[PDB]
Amino acid sequence: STKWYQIFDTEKLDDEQVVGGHLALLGVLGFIMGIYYISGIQVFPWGAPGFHDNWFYLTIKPRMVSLGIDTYSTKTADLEAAGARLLGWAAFHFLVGSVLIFGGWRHWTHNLTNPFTGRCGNFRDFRFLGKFGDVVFNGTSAKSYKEALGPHAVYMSLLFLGWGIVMWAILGFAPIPDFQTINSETFMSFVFAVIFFALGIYWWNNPPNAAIHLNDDMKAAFSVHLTAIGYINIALGCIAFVAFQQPSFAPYYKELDKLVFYLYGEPFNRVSFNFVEQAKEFADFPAYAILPKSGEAFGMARVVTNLIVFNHIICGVLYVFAGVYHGGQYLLKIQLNGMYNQIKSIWITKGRDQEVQVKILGTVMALCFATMLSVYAVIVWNTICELNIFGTNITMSFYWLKPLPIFQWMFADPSINDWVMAHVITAGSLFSLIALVRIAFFAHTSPLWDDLGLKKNSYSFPCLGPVYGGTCGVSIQDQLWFAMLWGIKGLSAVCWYIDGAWIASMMYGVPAADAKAWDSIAHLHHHYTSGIFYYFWTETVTIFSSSHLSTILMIGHLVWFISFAVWFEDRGSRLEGADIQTRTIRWLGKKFLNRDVNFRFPVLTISDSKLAGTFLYFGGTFMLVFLFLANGFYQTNSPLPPPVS
């Protein structure tokens, strides 16, 4: 059953096909970057105003400031220079992306003919360049992914050297080893060029061997690289959060708070029902014009930092989940093919014994249960103490429980909030890892399905029926969906922590007494925005204030409770209801149609119902989390006084 999400599946694609797809994607990404750069032109070089501060460009902006582009200037001439540089680099991106799309089409058609020299370049054998390829490799990687890592690292070294050159000439950043200032990223680009050239030549002369991927690279290598790059993206998000909070990046990020922005959808000055433009609130600005939103109050620096960090973090988590799912698909393929017993590598042979799988998954489950129970009991006890039910004041809460002084170096203000954040992240990581391990090990047969004589014969089978009163969602696809739903909690913890919230309790800052006395008894110079449940109330003030954020709120909520319809165990009910719908639509016969209504009402397959349900669930959840991170930072450095002295 080849669906519309299986036509681009790698099993049907070759190496050249995916090369062409990647190049087409790179070119389209360059075109999108040109769109964004144009969208960042604050004042047009024509002599006219510009675009209204898209979130895409507001994210892109500080990086551009790091370069010679995009001055943080209110001066109109310098801002026009910023627009000119942005537009020029956008046009350059457009040209390069067009050429990349052309190359991607050539590699998609397997039609590699140079117009100037009428020769056909073989994908399996060639020289990278006229002389450079003969200088370094003397040939081509022999159609094996392990042999390509060398040339790939050499190409990455070339790209790093080119980036250094571009910074040196066009952007005018002379490499010096001062890492606090901007003009060392080019020096480190050159250092990385040297390092990666050495690594590439070593891996070309000595290819590393993990022979699992080479055979069906299309899924095994895809899964391994996707999980690795997901962890890389998580690391990049962490590094970004640490660095954007550093004073070294401050000239490029804190100044974002100094300047105000006119955002698309930010509330406009409201005219009355009778405005004779031939009554208007905020008359100095023109009618239906966006009121400026001050960065200092909005915390635009941390808002952009949070958008970047959580974008990379969630993309990395999703990439990890997809890598595990695609590795499970490959493992199921080799399990049905009989190659699972023939892999001969540590990454499979260790999991070949089902008892080792049981031990690993049981250890993960025990750690998850223990950590989750500990942290959840702490959270609910803090909530109980601050709401004072059962006659417990916050002196009985876990305010004493700070991180260890040895481990206190990596927190701004040591508190129970950081403790609960770390414990929740570990618990959610293990919680998702339960399902990831299930995908990794139980792609074909679980120990239960070993005891009970069933086996999973597909990556997208719904279930095995009502036998044993169960069998729902044992497919690796369904385990991926459960892993995503379980990691929703961890990603939510990440977002709420980076935005600023009391995760150690649920209702922190509510008009209750001991909820307000938390800061008094905790000795914190940071006033966290609010507790878990009070976070919505405190941070929806802006979301309601802004019509655009409210529209996103409504759409995400609709998406979520439409996911509800396909998530539940109701597919048969929907099928019979659709048959009734079809029968009444046929009853539009004898309503003067004289037209045979050949329209059977469709109902998604369970393997498709869970797919749609998870997609809409995640989509609504994080369309709303975008508003969480776009409401504002709203963290004031002022401890709360006790309600009663």
Partner: protein, 98 residues
């Protein structure tokens, strides 16, 4: 051909029904008792079922009840079963996995 299904092994999932053309309707549910305890199984009508082999070639059976008898008489639970292997683990003494 003459495909059969072992109701002792079958658990009643009905992917054979999805793999059968609607015009034939060879696969059918037979109810025995409580649905949650295994309950219904599936059966083939030999006269109606005329050598499509879609069910077995789809290799969708979890229980291995979907069997194919051959003219010479051999029976197949799966199109290609993995080979049976003498399993015994490897631990290098000086490597980190010891």
């Amino acid at each position: 051909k003459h495909y059969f299904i072992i109701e002792n092994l079958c658990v009643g999932c009905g992917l054979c029904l999805d793999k059968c053309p609607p015009k034939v309707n060879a696969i059918g549910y037979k109810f025995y008792g409580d649905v949650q305890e295994g309950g219904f199984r599936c059966y083939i009508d030999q006269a109606a079922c005329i050598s499509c082999s879609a069910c077995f070639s789809g290799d969708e059976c979890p229980s291995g009840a979907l069997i194919e008898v051959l003219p010479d008489g051999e029976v197949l639970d799966f199109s290609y079963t993995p080979p049976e292997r003498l399993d015994f683990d490897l631990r290098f003494l000086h490597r980190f996995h010891r």
